[PDB]
Every structure is written in structure tokens, then in C-alpha cells.
Amino acid sequence: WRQQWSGPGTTKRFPETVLARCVKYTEIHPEMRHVDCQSVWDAFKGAFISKHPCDITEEDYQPLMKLGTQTVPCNKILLWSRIKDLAHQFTQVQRDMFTLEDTLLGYLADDLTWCGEFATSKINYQSCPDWRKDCSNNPVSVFWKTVSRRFAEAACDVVHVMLDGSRSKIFDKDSTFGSVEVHNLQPEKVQTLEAWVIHGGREDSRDLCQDPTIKELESIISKRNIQFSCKNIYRPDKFLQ
Ligand SMILES: COCCO[C@H]1CC[C@H](Nc2cc(=O)n(C)c3ccc(-c4cnn([C@@H]5O[C@H](COP(=O)(O)OP(=O)(O)OC[C@H]6O[C@@H](n7cnc8c(N)ncnc87)[C@H](O)[C@@H]6O)[C@@H](O)[C@H]5O)c4)cc23)CC1
């Protein structure tokens, strides 16, 4: 008998890839000289190997979180939801805004899938639990839930979030931003959450800050005692310049 999940299995060469990304990150960032990439890999593998892939906890990732500290300035955070490429293109142009992918852990795990099995050290290259179809507490989803919660908790001053105005649901309360990040912004550190609704499609222009999902985000943020601000980015290329 072999247990089979609905999701794709661990990315081929996952151990080598994580180790190589750790080494590349330390070679490009001077503030990472004290980081031992072999220890980072051992902490990462230790979070999920030998464990049932549907019973992973935020606590399983604590050793990895201790090795992969966050150093980005809290007043320069850009969150985003379903507009990844434009958000990262904007940060490369501003050079004074950072996303979760700018951190060691965000950079290590991006676009990778991984899981193990109970009692053995074997990484499952055949299949991994799908968050929706199999189980929410899988190694990948738990990792992103933990790292995005820490990223949001650290934020301060004005936090910006880029949203895709051409989507049917502009703010989706089920996304990582909607279900994790918004709920961990601290009012004693964060004065305002400012949404930038990008009009990056050919849709008929309209004030998208009036969309029902934006009113829902405003309500969530207001109940946390944080100010909400929303801006329409009617001309994204002009906003970049
Ligand atoms: C309270 O419990 C109940 C809720 O549970 C949480 C729900 C979220 C879940 N997130 C992910 C699950 C997981 O399996 N994978 C593999 C993840 C891969 C990466 C990240 C990711 C990276 N950056 N971020 C920070 O969050 C904001 C951006 O995320 P979003 O707003 O989600 O934007 P989206 O453009 O839609 O997605 C970003 C990517 O993630 C995938 N993803 C998203 N949601 C899921 C999901 N439920 N199941 C499977 N995959 C999911 C999606 O396919 C895309 O590749 C930014 O501000 C960043 O700082 C999060 C997240 C996930 C964790 C569990």
C-alpha cells in the first residue's frame, strides 16, 4: 500500500535547491555572514521529515525561524495579493520597499513544494497534500502561514498592499493576505494600511476603492484600530516612474 495525495510531490532536487539558494542569499547579502547554510537546511528538513504531512504545526518551523531572522526595515513593507510580478517589479524600481521574498525564508522557499512521511526520513517526491483537497496543516501551507504571520507582525508605520483591480474578487479574505497578514498587523506599530488597487487590465475605469471586497478589507482593518487608506493606481507605468 502507498499513500497518495492530490498535490504535486516535492520539487525534484529540493535539498540541493534550498542549500544553493541559502548560499546565494548569504553571498549577496553582507548581513548574513553568521548564517551556516547547512544548519538552515537541517532546521528546514527537521520541521517536516518523519512527521505526518497533515499534522504540521507552526512550532515545527520554530528552529528554522530562529536561524532565518527577518531584517527588513518595518516601515518599508509591501504586502500583495494576486499581483506578484508587478509588486516585485515596483520594489526593484523603488529600492526602498521590501516584500516577504526579500527575506531569507521567503527567498529559500519560493515556488517549491515539499513533504515527508511519518517515522522515516524520506522526502515524498510522488505527491504532497493539497491545502484545499487534502489538508490545511501540510508542510508547505504551514510554512507560509508561519512566515507571513511573522512578516506582518513586524510591520510598522504605513503598510502598503498591492491588489489586482482587474480580478473578480480584488480583496479575497481567503488569501494569505486576507486570512493571515491583515489579522496580525499591530495597531501600536502600524498607523495605516494603504491599499493600491492596480488598474493593470483593459477594464472600463472606475473608482475601485468602492468595491465591496475593498469595503470588507476596510472593515477588517478598522476593527483592528488601524486606519485604512485606498488609492486607485489608474496608470501603473506612470506610478512606477
Ligand atoms: C488561518 O488559516 C486559514 C488560512 O490558511 C492560510 C491560507 C494561505 C496559505 N498560503 C500558502 C499556502 C501554500 O500552500 N503555498 C504554496 C503558498 C505559497 C506562497 C505563499 C505566499 C508568498 N508570499 N505570501 C505573503 O502573503 C501575500 C501573498 O499571498 P496571497 O495573498 O495568498 O496571494 P496569492 O497571489 O493568492 O498567492 C501567493 C502564492 O501562494 C499560493 N497560495 C495562496 N494561498 C494558497 C492556499 N490556500 N493553498 C495553496 N497555495 C496557496 C498561490 O498559489 C501563489 O503561488 C504577500 O503579502 C506575501 O507577503 C504568501 C502562500 C502560500 C497558508 C494557510
Judged by DSSP in three states, 184 sits in helix
Torsion-angle region of 95 (φ positive above 0: left; ψ -120 to 50: alpha; else: beta): left
- What technique determined this structure? X-ray
Residue 15 C-alpha from the chain's centroid: 21
Determine which one of 115, 128, 135, 156 is catalytic: 156
Provide long-range contacts, Cβ within 8 A and 24+ apart, for 93-101.
93/240, 97/160, 98/72, 98/73, 100/147, 100/148, 100/151
User: 147 and 105 in contact (C-beta within 8 Å)?
Assistant: yes
User: 106 and 21 in contact (C-beta within 8 Å)?
Assistant: no
Query: Is 156 in the active site?
Result: yes
Ligand 1 atom at minimum distance from 151 CA: 59
User: 226 and 190 in contact (C-beta within 8 Å)?
Assistant: yes
Domain boundaries of the chain, sorted by first residue: 1-71+99-154, 72-98+155-241
* Composition of the chain by helix, strand, coil, percent to 5: 45, 15, 40
Distances (CA, A) of 104 to 35, 85, 115, 162: 10, 19, 20, 22
Resolution, Å (one decimal): 1.7
DSSP 213: H
CA 67–ligand 1 middle distance (angstroms): 22
Which residue shows C-alpha cell 502507498?
A: 2
Residues 171, 89: Cα–Cα separation, whole Å: 21
User: 185 and 226 in contact (C-beta within 8 Å)?
Assistant: yes
Which residue's CA is the closest to the ligand 1 atom numbered 53? Answer: 82
Judged by DSSP in three states, 167 sits in coil
